């Protein structure tokens, strides 16, 4: 197992994200060697209305 | 021969004697600037292939209509130009000849 | 019941009950101080 | 005609290809997601350019990307 | 009270035009009375009319008001001490006052923050909770003032989503 | 005193000319 | 739309309650002609009292124009 | 559409059918500039916006005050 | 595909109506051409600004030689005050008798236009005097005009075509440009106002033919030279000099009497004179300050590079900057536009106070239409400036070049300028709308006592710090303490004379109006301001849309998607903010205007009464000033003013227009077409003709431009009609 | 004599003579196609 495991909250370092700067719950971590494996889950919405995507693991930071 | 009608009864000089020379020198430079804007689309419509052909309702095959061309429109506006100023003329004729015109 | 206070507690109906305490009592002054254009001193 | 980019972000979740209203898009197998394909625009000249697929991208920020340019007939959207 | 002329502005107690502005006022008064008998409800309506317009004209003369040239009074906001009252006592009210409702405002939204389901609550105000916070804001000067001291009042940039540029 | 008709004509000479170099420039631009 | 009839309703009930108790109906019911129908009055709070305007019959009040006083009188 | 249709009936009636007779004919209310006049926009502007705008703009300091406050609230 | 978009091959093969409008519209945008080196772009601009330099000669020539020909030069001279200048003459087919016999004004025998651009006042002031000098005049400026065009058509030749790096030497530009073009410039105007101007003044004419021979001061260059400068100061024009003559005529060429010339009500011609002559040696000194050639002066990037904060407050201070402003076209094209609008509005708020034309201050009109002309045209210049400060922030700027600079801290703090921007523009407009809004409701309930008049102490008091003794602060210039008595020996008496003048407008009195307006004023600079920096600051990326900078300047939206994104772009900030512009240019101008009328009435009471409300405004400026205009025309004839009533009403239709382009979007429009393209498709003896461009509806910002461009020209034109009829109906 | 002459041509040459050129010019080389 890489990356934050599943419940830390990980400040997000991708610039051109809506939760750029905030802090958002890891659901899970893919171990297979994708390129975005860290699922994020946000308390607010974007302007799509999601509350969570797939960030890297040099994109997010606990 | 009809566009010279609005110019003589509406014109500025309609109720001057010169009503129907003005209305009809009008007709005349209309008739010219028309000749114009002939000779430009003539110039510039047709320059595609247009490789589809026509037919009638019938479906008999015909040829293509020789005024849809570039000479052949350019033999049409010069048509249109000496029927035109014919048409002008022959209207000033008859405001000056015509019995009932008033 | 309950609910219905639930219901009253709601943005709407909170602020139409502020803004008309809060009119009457700015009116209530304007009426025993009237024509204030300053603070008297 | 337009430009239409497909990222590496992309979850290939399908909404964009079934969104595009021209059959610009499709799904390409790809290791690079969990799902396992990437979408792609090989038809990029029937892409009028309705952002369908923008709409339609849940990934943020968008892993496809419709930038205007020379307009064309197809691109334009006309019957005539 | 008497003021002295400042910026090229007379007392309006001692304003020839304030009194013509009085004097303009109450004629009017007087032509709108003439058409109603004394006896009728319009014409006690406009006789208390009448007093209220030179109450109030008699007390913007001793409320140490600077008239002008058109014989309406103009206030001097740049700090003078024989015209604070213009601006600097109402604008300190203010500033208490909208500060205190800002103050409530922060307060329920940093305790609502807190809840299982902030937003629901957002447009469904506690008003019990609310209005505790709402009257704790009675010394929002001084809350706010611990609140910079302690560096609590703003959030760090690092925290704070900002654009990509 | 109004303008002489020899002044006003070259003075109309002269701006024909600069016209002819604006549509020399002008081309010459387009080029 | 019952709810809807019962607003109209409310308003007319309205309407007709200030043409009673907030009005000079039966003054411009006298003089028609001269005396200007009026079913409001106002508080005067901020010398908006001035909108009470001399609409005639020992009344003042907003002049109206929805024409109620003239649909009163012909029914 | 409606600005127009209520604009001109009220030139229309204003100049052509409201007035006073006095027994030497009729006094209309804008002296039947309606038909000399209403055939141009500057006419519309000048005649009909401007001319009969006086009232609402020096409505000030009487009842009609509050049209005034209206008129420039919904300006 | 056509050969219209030659630069654009997209445009070229684009089968719709689009294409001209397109090509139309990006045909100065060099940048953006197909197959466009720097090198070409350098060249195509050189000689761009070579061609509309010549247009500008031509303007100026095409000017004078319609006044010298058709013109009232020489009668107007004689009488400044009792005769109407002539612009040109009127040749209209569509004229009536009425038009024809209404329109001759001033001593012409033909239908004249009024010229209200004051070039009489101008020309008159420069020593001009007669049609022959205004011909010859003409006529230089057009072989300036020709030469200009020949120079440019030169240099784009390959032999004289200079390289990038010969636009991209800064240091030599600006030396020369500040000694010669600015400096000696401004020297050899100082020997025009000396030799010809002020003697024209005097009297005594000195053309050509007796140039050479009429010595400007009675002595000649022995005081210059001895170092005996006072001389040249010795003997000023009397108070009672009448200009153009020879009574009380002094001998002083150059002096700095300050205030005005009583007859005229303009600056004295010797001090302009003088002026001009510091000028010239300030900015000939100033033009050595940069290294070229010759191993001495400064180098502009090391200048640049020096300056950073030792502190770091600024963060890597100035590093790198030189390089991005020499580089980025844009970034120089909005300093300069910037500076530009700043001097133009200086142009206008100096004009009217400070009249530098003889017989100016007494003609109103002229007076009114100059500060409308340039407040408009400032305006419209600090929205192209910050504009194309966006359109750097996209294209030209470099955030890996320009990191840790004061341009990189901008795009890291530009939430906090944003956010505070609209903090001050939502203070301003909410007090500033609601001291208004009590006023007029004051002013309605019959008690007008109860206003909230706020005296504007602060601008009264800077007055009286300069002079002015209305208020009676009586602290720098009115009080008698070291300032004053310094100034009380060369320009304070004409100063004081002027500034304490009821009739001009050096320094207008100043009421609680004119602090409700200029809030106002405050208002609208700050929110045009807001709307300007924010689509700059923004136009790189913003939340909503992070990858902006990868669309250009000018796109219409990102699409429905994201909650909507219509408005998006920094082009569409421009957009927003021309608005915010207009508004605020028209808010000035109004202000300007309506105290202006007041003062010329005589009763500046009606506007410091009237002034504090809204009403007062739309009663007593708007709708009183408007009832000899809409009178242009009637049933009952027409009068001279009959074309600026077609003029307003000309623009109130331009501006709905464009109020159609605004509201109404593209997609009804292009289905619309659409329906029309069937109809003539299928209509007998229609189809015959077939368009060649497939008629499409206007694109999203093709037709926002086109709206704004509209609601502008509507805006100017129906204020330009009313400004000019209004003051000429009441005062010719 | 220019005063009375040239008025009354070179109105109807600029504001109906060279706009008719212009226009019909442009025109023709707008639609021009490339090739
Ligand atoms: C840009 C300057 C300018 C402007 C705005 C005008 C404006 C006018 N002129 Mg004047 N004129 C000018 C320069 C100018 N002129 C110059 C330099 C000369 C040469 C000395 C003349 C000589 C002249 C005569 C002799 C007459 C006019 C007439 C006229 C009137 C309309 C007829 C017309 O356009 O014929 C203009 C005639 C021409 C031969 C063209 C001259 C224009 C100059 C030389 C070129 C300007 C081009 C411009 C900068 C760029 C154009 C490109 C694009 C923006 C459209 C009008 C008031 C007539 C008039 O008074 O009618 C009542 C008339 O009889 N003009
Ligand atoms: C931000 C702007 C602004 C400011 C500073 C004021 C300030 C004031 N107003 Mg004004 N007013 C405003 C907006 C504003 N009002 C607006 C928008 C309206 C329209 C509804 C009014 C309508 C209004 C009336 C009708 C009256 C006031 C009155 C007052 C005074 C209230 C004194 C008090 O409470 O005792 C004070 C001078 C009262 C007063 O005493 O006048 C001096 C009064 O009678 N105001
Ligand atoms: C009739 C009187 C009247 C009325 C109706 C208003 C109405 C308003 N004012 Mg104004 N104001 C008035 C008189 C009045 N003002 C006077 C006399 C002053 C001088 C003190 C001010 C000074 C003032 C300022 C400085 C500001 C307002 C703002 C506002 C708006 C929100 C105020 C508020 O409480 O929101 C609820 C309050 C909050 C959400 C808390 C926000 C912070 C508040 C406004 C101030 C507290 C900060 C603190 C004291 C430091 C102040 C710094 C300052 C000196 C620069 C509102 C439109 C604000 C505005 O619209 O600007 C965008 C604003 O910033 N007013
Ligand atoms: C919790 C209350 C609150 C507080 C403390 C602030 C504070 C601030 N706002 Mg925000 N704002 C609020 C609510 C608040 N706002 C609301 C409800 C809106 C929507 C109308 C806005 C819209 C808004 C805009 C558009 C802007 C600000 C700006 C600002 C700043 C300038 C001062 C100011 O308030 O003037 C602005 C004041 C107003 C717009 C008046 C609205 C405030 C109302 C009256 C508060 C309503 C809530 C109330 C307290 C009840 C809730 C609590 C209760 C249940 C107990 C400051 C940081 C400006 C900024 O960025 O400056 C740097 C700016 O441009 N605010
Ligand atoms: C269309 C419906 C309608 C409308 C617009 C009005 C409007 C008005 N009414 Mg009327 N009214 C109505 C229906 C309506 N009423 C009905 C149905 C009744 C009978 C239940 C009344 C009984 C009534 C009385 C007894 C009085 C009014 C008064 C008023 C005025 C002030 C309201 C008030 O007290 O502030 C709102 C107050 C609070 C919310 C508390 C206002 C002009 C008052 C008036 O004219 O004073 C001179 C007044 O005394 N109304
Ligand atoms: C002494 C040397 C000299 C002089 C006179 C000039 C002059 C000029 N250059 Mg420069 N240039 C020089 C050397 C010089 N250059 C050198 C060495 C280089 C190589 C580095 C260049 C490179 C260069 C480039 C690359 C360009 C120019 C351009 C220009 C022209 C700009 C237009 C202009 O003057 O605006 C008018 C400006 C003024 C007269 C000065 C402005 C003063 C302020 C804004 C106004 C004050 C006005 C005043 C109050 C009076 C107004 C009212 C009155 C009319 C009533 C101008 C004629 C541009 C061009 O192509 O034009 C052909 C251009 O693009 N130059
Ligand atoms: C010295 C000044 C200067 C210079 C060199 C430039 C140069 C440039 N600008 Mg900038 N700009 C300026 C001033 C300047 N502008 C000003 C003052 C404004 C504010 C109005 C702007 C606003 C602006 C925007 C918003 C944009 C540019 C763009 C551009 C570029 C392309 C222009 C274009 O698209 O083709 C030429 C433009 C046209 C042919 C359109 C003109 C249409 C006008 C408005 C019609 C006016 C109607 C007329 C007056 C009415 C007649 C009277 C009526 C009675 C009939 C080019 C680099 C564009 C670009 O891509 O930048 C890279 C761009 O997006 N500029
Ligand atoms: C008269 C017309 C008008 C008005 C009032 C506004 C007002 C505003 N605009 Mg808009 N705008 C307009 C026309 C107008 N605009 C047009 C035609 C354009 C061109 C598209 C723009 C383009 C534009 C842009 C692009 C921007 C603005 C911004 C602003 C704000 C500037 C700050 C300010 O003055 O705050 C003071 C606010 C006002 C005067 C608004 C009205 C507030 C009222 C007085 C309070 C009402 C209270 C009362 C109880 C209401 C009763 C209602 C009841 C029935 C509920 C403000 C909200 C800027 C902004 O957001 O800055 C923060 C901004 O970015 N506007
Ligand atoms: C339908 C009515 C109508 C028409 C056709 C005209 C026509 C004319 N008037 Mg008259 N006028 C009218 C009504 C009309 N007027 C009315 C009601 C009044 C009020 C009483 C006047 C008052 C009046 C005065 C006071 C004057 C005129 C003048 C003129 C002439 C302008 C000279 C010219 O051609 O310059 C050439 C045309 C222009 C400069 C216009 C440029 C505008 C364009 C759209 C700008 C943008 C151009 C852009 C680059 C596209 C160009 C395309 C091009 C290639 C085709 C012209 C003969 C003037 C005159 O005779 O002077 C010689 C003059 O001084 N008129
Ligand atoms: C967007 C952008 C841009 C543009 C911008 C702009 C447009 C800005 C503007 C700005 C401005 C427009 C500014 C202004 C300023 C001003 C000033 C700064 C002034 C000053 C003054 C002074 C300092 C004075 C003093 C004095 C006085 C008080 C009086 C008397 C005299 C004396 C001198 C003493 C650029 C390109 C850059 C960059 C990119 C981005
Ligand atoms: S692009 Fe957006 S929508 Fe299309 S597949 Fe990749 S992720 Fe799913």
Same mark, same amino acid.
């Given at each position: 197992?890489?990356?934050?495991?599943?419940?830390?909250?990980?400040?997000?370092?991708?610039?051109?994200?809506?939760?750029?700067?905030?802090?958002?719950?890891?659901?899970?971590?893919?171990?297979?060697?994708?390129?975005?494996?860290?699922?994020?889950?946000?308390?607010?919405?974007?302007?799509?209305?999601?509350?969570?995507?797939?960030?890297?693991?040099?994109?997010?930071?606990? | 021969?009809?566009?010279?009608?609005?110019?003589?009864?509406?014109?500025?000089?309609?109720?001057?004697?010169?009503?129907?020379?003005?209305?009809?020198?009008?007709?005349?430079?209309?008739?010219?600037?028309?000749?114009?804007?002939?000779?430009?689309?003539?110039?510039?419509?047709?320059?595609?292939?247009?490789?589809?052909?026509?037919?009638?309702?019938?479906?008999?095959?015909?040829?293509?209509?020789?005024?849809?061309?570039?000479?052949?429109?350019?033999?049409?506006?010069?048509?249109?130009?000496?029927?035109?100023?014919?048409?002008?003329?022959?209207?000033?004729?008859?405001?000056?000849?015509?019995?009932?015109?008033? | 019941?309950?609910?219905?206070?639930?219901?009253?507690?709601?943005?709407?109906?909170?602020?139409?009950?502020?803004?008309?305490?809060?009119?009457?009592?700015?009116?209530?002054?304007?009426?025993?101080?009237?024509?204030?254009?300053?603070?008297?001193? | 005609?337009?430009?239409?980019?497909?990222?590496?972000?992309?979850?290939?979740?399908?909404?964009?290809?079934?969104?595009? $209203?021209?059959?610009?898009?499709?799904?390409? $197998?790809?290791?690079?997601?969990?799902?396992?394909?990437?979408?792609?625009? $090989?038809?990029?000249?029937?892409?009028?350019?309705?952002?369908?697929?923008?709409?339609?991208? $849940?990934?943020?920020?968008?892993?496809?990307?419709?930038?205007?340019?020379?307009?064309?007939?197809?691109?334009?959207?006309?019957?005539? | 009270?008497?003021?002295?002329?400042?910026?090229?502005?007379?007392?309006?107690?001692?304003?020839?035009?304030?009194?013509?502005?009085?004097?303009?006022?109450?004629?009017?008064?007087?032509?709108?009375?003439?058409?109603?008998?004394?006896?009728?409800?319009?014409?006690?309506?406009?006789?208390?009319?009448?007093?209220?317009?030179?109450?109030?004209?008699?007390?913007?003369?001793?409320?140490?008001?600077?008239?002008?040239?058109?014989?309406?009074?103009?206030?001097?906001?740049?700090?003078?001490?024989?015209?604070?009252?213009?601006?600097?006592?109402?604008?300190?009210?203010?500033?208490?006052?909208?500060?205190?409702?800002?103050?409530?405002?922060?307060?329920?939204?940093?305790?609502?923050?807190?809840?299982?389901?902030?937003?629901?609550?957002?447009?469904?105000?506690?008003?019990?909770?609310?209005?505790?916070?709402?009257?704790?804001?009675?010394?929002?000067?001084?809350?706010?003032?611990?609140?910079?001291?302690?560096?609590?009042?703003?959030?760090?940039?690092?925290?704070?989503?900002?654009?990509?540029? | 005193?109004?303008?002489?008709?020899?002044?006003?004509?070259?003075?109309?000479?002269?701006?024909?000319?600069?016209?002819?170099?604006?549509?020399?420039?002008?081309?010459?631009?387009?080029? | 739309?019952?709810?809807?009839?019962?607003?109209?309703?409310?308003?007319?009930?309205?309407?007709?309650?200030?043409?009673?108790?907030?009005?000079?109906?039966?003054?411009?019911?006298?003089?028609?002609?001269?005396?200007?129908?009026?079913?409001?009055?106002?508080?005067?709070?901020?010398?908006?009292?001035?909108?009470?305007?001399?609409?005639?019959?020992?009344?003042?009040?907003?002049?109206?124009?929805?024409?109620?006083?003239?649909?009163?009188?012909?029914? | 559409?409606?600005?127009?249709?209520?604009?001109?009936?009220?030139?229309?009636?204003?100049?052509?059918?409201?007035?006073?007779?006095?027994?030497?004919?009729?006094?209309?209310?804008?002296?039947?500039?309606?038909?000399?006049?209403?055939?141009?926009?500057?006419?519309?502007?000048?005649?009909?916006?401007?001319?009969?705008?006086?009232?609402?703009?020096?409505?000030?300091?009487?009842?009609?005050?509050?049209?005034?406050?209206?008129?420039?609230?919904?300006? | 595909?056509?050969?219209?978009?030659?630069?654009?091959?997209?445009?070229?093969?684009?089968?719709?109506?689009?294409?001209?409008?397109?090509?139309?519209?990006?045909?100065?945008?060099?940048?953006?051409?197909?197959?466009?080196?720097?090198?070409?772009?350098?060249?195509?601009?050189?000689?761009?600004?070579?061609?509309?330099?010549?247009?500008?000669?031509?303007?100026?020539?095409?000017?004078?030689?319609?006044?010298?020909?058709?013109?009232?030069?020489?009668?107007?001279?004689?009488?400044?005050?009792?005769?109407?200048?002539?612009?040109?003459?009127?040749?209209?087919?569509?004229?009536?008798?009425?038009?024809?016999?209404?329109?001759?004004?001033?001593?012409?025998?033909?239908?004249?236009?009024?010229?209200?651009?004051?070039?009489?006042?101008?020309?008159?002031?420069?020593?001009?005097?007669?049609?022959?000098?205004?011909?010859?005049?003409?006529?230089?400026?057009?072989?300036?005009?020709?030469?200009?065009?020949?120079?440019?058509?030169?240099?784009?030749?390959?032999?004289?075509?200079?390289?990038?790096?010969?636009?991209?030497?800064?240091?030599?530009?600006?030396?020369?440009?500040?000694?010669?073009?600015?400096?000696?410039?401004?020297?050899?105007?100082?020997?025009?106002?000396?030799?010809?101007?002020?003697?024209?003044?005097?009297?005594?004419?000195?053309?050509?033919?007796?140039?050479?021979?009429?010595?400007?001061?009675?002595?000649?260059?022995?005081?210059?030279?001895?170092?005996?400068?006072?001389?040249?100061?010795?003997?000023?024009?009397?108070?009672?000099?009448?200009?153009?003559?020879?009574?009380?005529?002094?001998?002083?060429?150059?002096?700095?009497?300050?205030?005005?010339?009583?007859?005229?009500?303009?600056?004295?011609?010797?001090?302009?004179?003088?002026?001009?002559?510091?000028?010239?040696?300030?900015?000939?000194?100033?033009?050595?300050?940069?290294?070229?050639?010759?191993?001495?002066?400064?180098?502009?990037?090391?200048?640049?590079?020096?300056?950073?904060?030792?502190?770091?407050?600024?963060?890597?201070?100035?590093?790198?900057?030189?390089?991005?402003?020499?580089?980025?076209?844009?970034?120089?094209?909005?300093?300069?536009?910037?500076?530009?609008?700043?001097?133009?509005?200086?142009?206008?708020?100096?004009?009217?106070?400070?009249?530098?034309?003889?017989?100016?201050?007494?003609?109103?009109?002229?007076?009114?239409?100059?500060?409308?002309?340039?407040?408009?045209?400032?305006?419209?210049?600090?929205?192209?400036?910050?504009?194309?400060?966006?359109?750097?922030?996209?294209?030209?700027?470099?955030?890996?070049?320009?990191?840790?600079?004061?341009?990189?801290?901008?795009?890291?703090?530009?939430?906090?300028?944003?956010?505070?921007?609209?903090?001050?523009?939502?203070?301003?407009?909410?007090?500033?709308?609601?001291?208004?809004?009590?006023?007029?409701?004051?002013?309605?309930?019959?008690?007008?006592?109860?206003?909230?008049?706020?005296?504007?102490?602060?601008?009264?008091?800077?007055?009286?710090?300069?002079?002015?003794?209305?208020?009676?602060?009586?602290?720098?210039?009115?009080?008698?303490?070291?300032?004053?008595?310094?100034?009380?020996?060369?320009?304070?008496?004409?100063?004081?004379?002027?500034?304490?003048?009821?009739?001009?407008?050096?320094?207008?009195?100043?009421?609680?109006?004119?602090?409700?307006?200029?809030?106002?004023?405050?208002?609208?600079?700050?929110?045009?301001?807001?709307?300007?920096?924010?689509?700059?600051?923004?136009?790189?990326?913003?939340?909503?849309?992070?990858?902006?900078?990868?669309?250009?300047?000018?796109?219409?939206?990102?699409?429905?998607?994201?909650?909507?994104?219509?408005?998006?772009?920094?082009?569409?900030?421009?957009?927003?903010?021309?608005?915010?512009?207009?508004?605020?240019?028209?808010?000035?101008?109004?202000?300007?205007?309506?105290?202006?009328?007041?003062?010329?009435?005589?009763?500046?009471?009606?506007?410091?009464?009237?002034?504090?409300?809204?009403?007062?405004?739309?009663?007593?400026?708007?709708?009183?000033?408007?009832?000899?205009?809409?009178?242009?025309?009637?049933?009952?004839?027409?009068?001279?003013?009959?074309?600026?009533?077609?003029?307003?009403?000309?623009?109130?239709?331009?501006?709905?227009?464009?109020?159609?382009?605004?509201?109404?979007?593209?997609?009804?429009?292009?289905?619309?077409?659409?329906?029309?393209?069937?109809?003539?498709?299928?209509?007998?003896?229609?189809?015959?003709?077939?368009?060649?461009?497939?008629?499409?509806?206007?694109?999203?910002?093709?037709?926002?431009?086109?709206?704004?461009?509209?609601?502008?020209?509507?805006?100017?034109?129906?204020?330009?009609?009313?400004?000019?009829?209004?003051?000429?109906?009441?005062?010719? | 004599?220019?005063?009375?002459?040239?008025?009354?041509?070179?109105?109807?040459?600029?504001?109906?003579?060279?706009?008719?050129?212009?226009?019909?010019?442009?025109?023709?080389?707008?639609?021009?196609?490339?090739?």
């Amino acid at each position: 197992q890489v990356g934050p495991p599943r419940g830390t909250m990980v400040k997000i370092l991708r610039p051109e994200s809506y939760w750029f700067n905030d802090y958002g719950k890891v659901i899970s971590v893919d171990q297979t060697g994708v390129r975005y494996p860290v699922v994020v889950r946000f308390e607010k919405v974007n302007y799509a209305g999601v509350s969570t995507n797939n960030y890297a693991l040099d994109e997010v930071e606990y | 021969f009809f566009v010279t009608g609005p110019f003589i009864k509406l014109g500025p000089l309609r109720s001057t004697d010169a009503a129907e020379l003005a209305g009809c020198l009008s007709g005349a430079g209309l008739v010219l600037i028309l000749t114009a804007c002939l000779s430009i689309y003539g110039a510039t419509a047709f320059q595609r292939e247009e490789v589809v052909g026509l037919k009638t309702l019938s479906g008999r095959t015909i040829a293509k209509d020789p005024l849809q061309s570039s000479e052949g429109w350019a033999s049409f506006t010069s048509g249109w130009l000496v029927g035109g100023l014919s048409g002008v003329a022959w209207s000033y004729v008859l405001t000056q000849v015509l019995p009932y015109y008033s | 019941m309950k609910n219905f206070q639930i219901y009253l507690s709601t943005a709407p109906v909170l602020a139409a009950v502020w803004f008309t305490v809060l009119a009457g009592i700015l009116i209530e002054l304007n009426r025993f101080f009237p024509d204030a254009l300053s603070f008297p001193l | 005609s337009h430009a239409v980019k497909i990222y590496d972000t992309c979850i290939g979740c399908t909404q964009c290809v079934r969104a595009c $209203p021209t059959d610009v898009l499709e799904m390409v $197998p790809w290791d690079g997601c969990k799902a396992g394909q990437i979408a792609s625009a $090989p038809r990029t000249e029937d892409c009028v350019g309705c952002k369908r697929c923008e709409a339609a991208c $849940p990934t943020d920020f968008l892993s496809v990307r419709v930038y205007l340019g020379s307009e064309t007939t197809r691109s334009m959207g006309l019957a005539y | 009270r008497d003021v002295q002329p400042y910026a090229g502005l007379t007392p309006c107690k001692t304003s020839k035009a304030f009194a013509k502005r009085e004097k303009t006022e109450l004629k009017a008064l007087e032509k709108r009375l003439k058409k109603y008998d004394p006896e009728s409800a319009p014409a006690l309506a406009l006789q208390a009319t009448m007093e209220k317009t030179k109450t109030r004209f008699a007390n913007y003369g001793e409320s140490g008001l600077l008239c002008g040239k058109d014989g309406l009074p103009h206030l001097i906001v740049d700090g003078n001490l024989e015209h604070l009252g213009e601006f600097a006592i109402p604008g300190l009210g203010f500033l208490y006052v909208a500060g205190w409702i800002g103050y409530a405002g922060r307060s329920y939204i940093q305790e609502n923050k807190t809840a299982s389901k902030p937003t629901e609550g957002e447009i469904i105000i506690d008003v019990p909770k609310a209005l505790g916070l709402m009257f704790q804001a009675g010394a929002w000067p001084l809350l706010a003032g611990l609140e910079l001291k302690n560096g609590t009042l703003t959030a760090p940039e690092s925290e704070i989503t900002v654009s990509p540029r | 005193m109004p303008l002489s008709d020899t002044q006003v004509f070259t003075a109309l000479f002269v701006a024909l000319i600069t016209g002819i170099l604006s549509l020399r420039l002008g081309t010459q631009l387009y080029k | 739309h019952f709810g809807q009839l019962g607003v109209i309703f409310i308003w007319l009930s309205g309407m007709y309650f200030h043409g009673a108790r907030f009005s000079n109906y039966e003054a411009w019911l006298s003089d028609p002609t001269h005396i200007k129908p009026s079913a409001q009055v106002v508080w005067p709070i901020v010398g908006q009292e001035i909108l009470n305007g001399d609409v005639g019959g020992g009344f003042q009040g907003v002049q109206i124009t929805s024409g109620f006083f003239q649909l009163w009188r012909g029914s | 559409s409606i600005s127009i249709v209520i604009f001109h009936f009220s030139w229309k009636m204003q100049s052509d059918v409201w007035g006073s007779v006095t027994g030497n004919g009729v006094s209309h209310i804008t002296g039947g500039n309606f038909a000399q006049s209403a055939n141009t926009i500057n006419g519309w502007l000048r005649d009909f916006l401007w001319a009969q705008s006086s009232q609402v703009i020096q409505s000030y300091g009487s009842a009609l005050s509050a049209y005034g406050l209206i008129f420039l609230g919904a300006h | 595909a056509t050969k219209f978009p030659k630069f654009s091959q997209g445009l070229a093969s684009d089968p719709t109506t689009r294409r001209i409008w397109f090509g139309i519209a990006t045909a100065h945008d060099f940048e953006t051409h197909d197959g466009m080196t720097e090198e070409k772009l350098y060249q195509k601009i050189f000689a761009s600004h070579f061609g509309q330099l010549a247009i500008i000669f031509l303007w100026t020539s095409g000017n004078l030689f319609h006044v010298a020909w058709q013109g009232n030069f020489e009668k107007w001279g004689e009488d400044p005050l009792h005769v109407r200048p002539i612009a040109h003459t009127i040749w209209d087919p569509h004229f009536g008798q009425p038009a024809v016999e209404a329109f001759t004004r001033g001593g012409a025998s033909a239908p004249v236009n009024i010229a209200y651009s004051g070039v009489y006042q101008w020309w008159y002031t420069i020593g001009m005097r007669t049609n022959v000098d205004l011909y010859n005049g003409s006529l230089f400026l057009l072989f300036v005009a020709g030469l200009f065009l020949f120079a440019g058509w030169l240099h784009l030749q390959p032999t004289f075509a200079p390289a990038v790096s010969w636009f991209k030497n800064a240091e030599s530009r600006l030396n020369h440009h500040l000694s010669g073009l600015f400096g000696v410039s401004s020297l050899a105007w100082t020997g025009h106002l000396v030799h010809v101007a002020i003697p024209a003044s005097r009297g005594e004419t000195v053309r050509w033919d007796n140039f050479l021979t009429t010595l400007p001061h009675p002595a000649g260059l022995a005081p210059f030279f001895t170092g005996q400068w006072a001389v040249y100061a010795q003997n000023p024009d009397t108070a009672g000099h009448i200009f153009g003559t020879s009574e009380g005529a002094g001998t002083a060429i150059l002096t700095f009497l300050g205030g005005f010339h009583p007859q005229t009500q303009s600056l004295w011609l010797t001090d302009m004179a003088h002026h001009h002559l510091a000028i010239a040696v300030v900015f000939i000194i100033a033009g050595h300050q940069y290294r070229t050639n010759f191993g001495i002066g400064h180098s502009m990037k090391e200048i640049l590079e020096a300056h950073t904060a030792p502190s770091g407050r600024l963060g890597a201070g100035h590093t790198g900057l030189f390089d991005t402003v020499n580089n980025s076209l844009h970034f120089q094209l909005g300093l300069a536009l910037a500076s530009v609008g700043v001097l133009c509005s200086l142009t206008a708020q100096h004009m009217y106070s400070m009249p530098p034309y003889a017989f100016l201050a007494q003609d109103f009109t002229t007076q009114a239409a100059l500060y409308s002309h340039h407040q408009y045209i400032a305006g419209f210049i600090m929205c192209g400036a910050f504009a194309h400060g966006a359109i750097f922030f996209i294209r030209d700027y470099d955030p890996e070049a320009n990191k840790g600079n004061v341009l990189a801290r901008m795009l890291e703090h530009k939430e906090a300028i944003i956010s505070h921007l609209s903090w001050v523009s939502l203070f301003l407009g909410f007090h500033t709308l609601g001291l208004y809004v009590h006023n007029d409701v004051m002013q309605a309930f019959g008690t007008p006592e109860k206003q909230i008049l706020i005296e504007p102490v602060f601008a009264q008091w800077i007055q009286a710090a300069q002079g002015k003794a209305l208020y009676g602060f009586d602290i720098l210039l009115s009080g008698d303490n070291a300032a004053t008595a310094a100034g009380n020996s060369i320009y304070l008496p004409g100063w004081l004379a002027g500034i304490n003048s009821s009739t001009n407008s050096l320094f207008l009195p100043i009421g609680p109006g004119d602090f409700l307006v200029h809030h106002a004023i405050a208002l609208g600079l700050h929110t045009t301001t807001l709307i300007l920096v924010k689509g700059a600051l923004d136009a790189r990326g913003s939340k909503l849309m992070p990858d902006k900078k990868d669309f250009g300047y000018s796109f219409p939206c990102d699409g429905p998607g994201r909650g909507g994104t219509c408005d998006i772009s920094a082009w569409d900030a421009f957009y927003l903010a021309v608005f915010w512009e207009l508004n605020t240019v028209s808010w000035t101008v109004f202000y300007f205007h309506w105290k202006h009328l007041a003062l010329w009435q005589g009763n500046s009471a009606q506007f410091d009464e009237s002034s504090t409300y809204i009403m007062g405004w739309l009663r007593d400026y708007l709708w009183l000033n408007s009832s000899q205009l809409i009178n242009g025309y009637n049933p009952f004839g027409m009068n001279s003013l009959s074309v600026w009533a077609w003029m307003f009403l000309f623009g109130h239709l331009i501006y709905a227009t464009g109020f159609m382009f605004l509201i109404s979007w593209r997609g009804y429009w292009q289905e619309l077409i659409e329906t029309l393209v069937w109809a003539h498709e299928r209509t007998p003896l229609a189809n015959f003709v077939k368009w060649n461009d497939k008629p499409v509806a206007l694109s999203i910002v093709q037709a926002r431009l086109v709206g704004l461009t509209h609601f502008a020209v509507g805006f100017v034109l129906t204020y330009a009609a009313f400004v000019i009829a209004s003051t000429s109906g009441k005062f010719g | 004599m220019a005063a009375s002459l040239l008025p009354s041509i070179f109105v109807p040459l600029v504001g109906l003579v060279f706009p008719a050129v212009a226009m019909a010019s442009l025109f023709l080389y707008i639609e021009k196609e490339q090739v």
